[PDB]
Amino acid sequence: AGYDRHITIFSPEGRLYQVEYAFKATNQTNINSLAVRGKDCTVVISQKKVPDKLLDPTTVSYIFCISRTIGMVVNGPIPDARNAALRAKAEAAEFRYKYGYDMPCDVLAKRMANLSQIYTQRAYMRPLGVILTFVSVDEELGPSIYKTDPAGYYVGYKATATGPKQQEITTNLENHFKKSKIDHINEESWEKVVEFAITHMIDALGTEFSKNDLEVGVATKDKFFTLSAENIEERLVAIAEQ
Amino acid sequence: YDRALSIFSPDGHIFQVEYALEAVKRGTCAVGVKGKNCVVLGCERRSTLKLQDTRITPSKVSKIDSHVVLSFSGLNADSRILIEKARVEAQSHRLTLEDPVTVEYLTRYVAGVQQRYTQSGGVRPFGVSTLIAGFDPRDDEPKLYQTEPSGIYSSWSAQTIGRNSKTVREFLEKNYDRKEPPATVEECVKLTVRSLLEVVQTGAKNIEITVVKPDSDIVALSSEEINQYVTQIEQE
Amino acid sequence: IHSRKMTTDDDINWQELARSTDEFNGAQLKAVTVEAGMIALRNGQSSVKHEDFVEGISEVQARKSKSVSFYA
Amino acid sequence: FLTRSEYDRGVSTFSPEGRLFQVEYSLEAIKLGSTAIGIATKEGVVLGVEKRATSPLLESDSIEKIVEIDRHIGCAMSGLTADARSMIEHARTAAVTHNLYYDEDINVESLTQSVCDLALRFGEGASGEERLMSRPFGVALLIAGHDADDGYQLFHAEPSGTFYRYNAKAIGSGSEGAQAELLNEWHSSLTLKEAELLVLKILKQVMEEKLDENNAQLSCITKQDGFKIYDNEKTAELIKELKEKEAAE
């Protein structure tokens, strides 16, 4: 019928144009993210950009703290970002409540994936236009990255990037794990993994950075933290002295 | 679902009632004539199809109480719903008010029943029209009513509905008399058989007759009986 | 500006008319000043009163009356 | 047919007119109604209806449009009567409720107004109360009555949800030819029988069949006798006495 794509219904090609369109709204902030696995840590960086000075820079964020061990990095519009953040925090509380231990990242990936599926099966839900990266350090699975997308599909990774120009970053990561011959960087301090990540980002995007142009989130064991600008500056200085 | 299946029309109507009436025009034809002490409902059955079991299949005249019959034209599938509701109401009356229904009250109920699926949302009207006939208890006046899918109810001296009802109606103006019904039951029966042979034609196997006499006597005449009556009409 | 062409009486007040017409465009207003002298011809005059322009408000506007109202 | 309309997809939607279209349509379904004439005097109110035969096989003395609400309120329906079927039940209930609560006769106006509240419930689900209709009613009532506080009243109840108190009113198909005559012939010095014969008069002219007691029906509301439906014999007498005064001109 004339409506195949104002509601979630297959096309004559056997398809969902609507969900496609969701994927075509993940590149509007044009933020890029890069996430790699250390040996005992997980590191993720994202861009920060403010179009005006009259914003306060602190509040502009894309790294959202969901659990105490799971960080969430969002690619796509910020309204949907906030709705997703709220969803996830609810589910985390509820897992702790019903099973007696904090939510694993894997379980969260899947819970959020199924909610996604439900938004693309009900004829009056609009799907989220956000790709979520879940970074964690598990004690049963180790440092892990799970990526879910508006489809409700998710997959694991050794490393991954997101954004409009994230192919460049894919090249970088590919070559890096080509030389290393192993699925994670062998580094025993989270600092140097931040450093490596920023190096690959400068190479990939072709542009140098500053403390107010970055945003860094680190998942160590049994915690998650974000660095402030002051600590990011120090990483940048130690890059030049490699 | 609470969306309308009934849209008001600027014509002064609702399209679906018009469409319902059409549906009722495509249905098989029923005739109703009341004597002085009887009621006679004659109905066309299409037994033109062969190898049809007719023993186990309900006639197109349904007893709704021990003295109240209902015949119908229009959507066959739909009618059964009305029929169940009506039998239910029949028992309710005895339960709370005590003394089987009267024809008028039951007629009124059916009227409201078909009306409701017009005015409600989420529902389309029934395209079914009924002839309700019978007796009141403690009484011996035949009462013959007609309800139509407009949710409007009528009394009639005689009436016909279904396919090509106009032809038989013209016949009835001219062979039934407002002043005088045919007083013997048999003559009434044969008047209606003679009516039916206008349109029904093609032998006397498609004709069905139910006759009701007060004191709760509903009997349906089998094909043999009809054969005799028809042949008499044929000879004359 | 229109009424300067035609001959009027000397009892006319151009604010009275302008109060009693609200949201009238210049074509409508041209269409009152002409309309007054129709009425003057029908009465049969040679001068155009100040009462006539007032009746050309109703006879010619843009719309025939507010409409039939049944509970508006 | 298919008159140009921008909106028939909602049932509560505007309309560059500034008013509802469905309500407008409803008032165009009262022009197919069988004529009901009603003369209100200060001595009683007279409700006359043409019963409207359609076949000589149709029994027309077992159908009627005069419907009793209660002993002191009568009502005549014209338009689509399947809708009136519901409304009249509701009104009867309301009256009985008032007499339960107050042991008192209900005002003619209060009743008319209650049924107007009923008329305006069409919708998909909107304001604080649930819509249990989806399309407006297409039937208008002439509610006649007598109360001891304002005397005799005759009200025209609209499918709009609006009510106007009339001193005489005709509805149906022949309503305009009747109302032209109402405007001229009515006054406040009428008597009961004079108004009665006036009804039969104006019913004659909107008669599409012929006037006799088999397609025409009278009913009155009087103070000390209540609501009384005139049987057919009495109606016949009045019709013949009209024919006497018609041949005196």
Place this chain on the structure above:
Amino acid sequence: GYDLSNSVFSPDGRNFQVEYAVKAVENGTTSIGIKCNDGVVFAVEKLITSKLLVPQKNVKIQVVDRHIGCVYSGLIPDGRHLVNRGREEAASFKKLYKTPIPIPAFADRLGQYVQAHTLYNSVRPFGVSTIFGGVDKNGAHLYMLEPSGSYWGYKGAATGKGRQSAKAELEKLVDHHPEGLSAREAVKQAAKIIYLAHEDNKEKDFELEISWCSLSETNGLHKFVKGDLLQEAIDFAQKEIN
């Protein structure tokens, strides 16, 4: 025909609905929020449309709980609904946790509520920009809330028709005082820049409203400016623009 509903997407990343709501907001009057060191100062331009009105008898700034001022532009009845909703949520928090709601928490709540109206065919996204802020115990904060369900931190925010002028003037005010100014001193500045934002609007006459929530002068409660103080601000602006 992707302009028909909010739950539709388009292959341009657009959801035409929501963009159109911004044009409803562009129809409102100037409304400014000045973030000062001590608190926040709101001001609204109140057009005097006719000489039949009762002056200073209509408020477009309404408080929620007692320490969060809310001033909105766009559709006045619609924004009115939004403020009512936010008071319900504020009272809920206050009952459940025994403390007046924090300003970031408030921000979460209202953002979610407006984000909700784009996920269902059943509703229409609100066409209002809100500016709300105040003093809580973790300091003064300021937020501007989009009809899109987006918001950010701000050192100065504005909306309305004379937003052009106001934004530029605020840029200057942060260039005069890169360490900020007093909420006492900001009364006069709100007067100033509303007056400057009425030359794009100089069809009419207007009345100035100012209100403020600062820790140093109202003790952290949202109060209105009046009397000699209000009239002095008026005179200040008046002399500047002549």
Place this chain on the structure above:
Amino acid sequence: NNYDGDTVTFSPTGRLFQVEYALEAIKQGSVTVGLRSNTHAVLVALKRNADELSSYQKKIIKCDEHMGLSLAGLAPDARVLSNYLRQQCNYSSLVFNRKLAVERAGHLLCDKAQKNTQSYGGRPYGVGLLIIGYDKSGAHLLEFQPSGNVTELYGTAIGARSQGAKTYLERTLDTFIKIDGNPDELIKAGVEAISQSLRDESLTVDNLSIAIVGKDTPFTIYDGEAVAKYI
């Protein structure tokens, strides 16, 4: 119907056309004029008959013994809103032992309109109300729109030819503010105000409907031969 249809749509102009359609309900309504001094509020409504055998249709609904509303536009909508207002006024008398304030009730009414403007399958009400009352803060006259806008004015009008009343009130504005303790004068000024908004629809003693509220006077409706003192 491109963007014009539905109470859910935008409208590349930022608008919605349903609202303007509903304001046409005001335009095809009959004129009504409200004016207030500091001690009395007066509503003067032009009733209107359907025909000569018909009576006039009321235009002023008593809400409370200090509070009144008068409709302009569709009667059936006015009916929903008037019930609502009486409900919460009796509420406030019950729970707070307090008269319901005018300023407040405007806001309640505001939200009640907003939410049929929110949901699909609603409609904006096609009736604009003038609500007068006298409370502990004095006289008040509120103007209520189909938009859901409540405004406080010294004197206003709605209906057909509402403009001709506003101009009249623009001249006589500072007259009727200085008249206080003499309700008669305010009533006469309102009769004169609505004289400017006639279509040669002459003021009769059963076409004009007056209602007043005072410092010392409950809300009253004058009709019949009570209005002859002013005509």
